[PDB]
């Protein structure tokens, strides 16, 4: 998310100084006996060609062209994030984007607005309550 995620901006090989974001749902691992903070998730991936060097023609300031831009979109929640979609993009020399069809996803969202009411347990109805239970 450093370079402008806008479809109407082709990114650049240099990223400026906006700085890479940290995910909403940050945490750590521990399992190797150490702190293991987990923070960065990617949203754009970029193919760069050093055109005039590829031409063997020129090398001064051959800042590579962004050939194509994979673009990646996530659902974000306080405890998780994961892809809503991806899409392939390329760019006209006037900088107009051209697009492939996107590709969507929807993993099972935990929700508790869902949650329904109670029911009794005729199958069990007395077999607990301190000592009356074992399992």
């Amino acid at each position: 998310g450093e370079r402008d995620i806008s479809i109407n901006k082709i990114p650049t090989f240099e990223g400026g100084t906006t700085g890479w974001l940290a995910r909403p749902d940050m945490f750590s691992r521990y399992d190797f006996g150490i702190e293991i903070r987990n923070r960065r998730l990617c949203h754009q991936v970029l193919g760069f060609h050093r055109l005039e060097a590829l031409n063997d023609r020129d090398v001064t300031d051959e800042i590579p062209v962004l050939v194509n831009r994979l673009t990646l979109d996530y659902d974000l929640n306080n405890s998780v994030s994961t892809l809503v979609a991806v899409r392939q993009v390329a760019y006209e020399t006037d900088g107009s984007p051209i697009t492939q069809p996107p590709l969507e996803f929807d993993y099972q969202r935990f929700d508790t607005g869902s949650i329904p009411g109670w029911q009794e347990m005729p199958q069990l109805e007395a077999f607990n309550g301190y000592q009356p239970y074992q399992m």
């Binding site: 007395a126 077999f127 309550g129 301190y130 009356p132």
Partner: protein
């Protein structure tokens, strides 16, 4: 020799935490005695 000391008895049924367990018992006779 052989003779009775005492005895107890029970039922498994989970009547409820304190519900009405209720019954009566007696020997009609220990026909042999003494």
């Amino acid at each position: 020799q052989r003779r009775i000391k005492s005895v107890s008895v029970s039922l498994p049924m989970l009547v409820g935490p304190y519900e009405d367990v209720c019954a009566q018992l007696t020997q009609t006779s220990s026909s042999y005695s003494t």
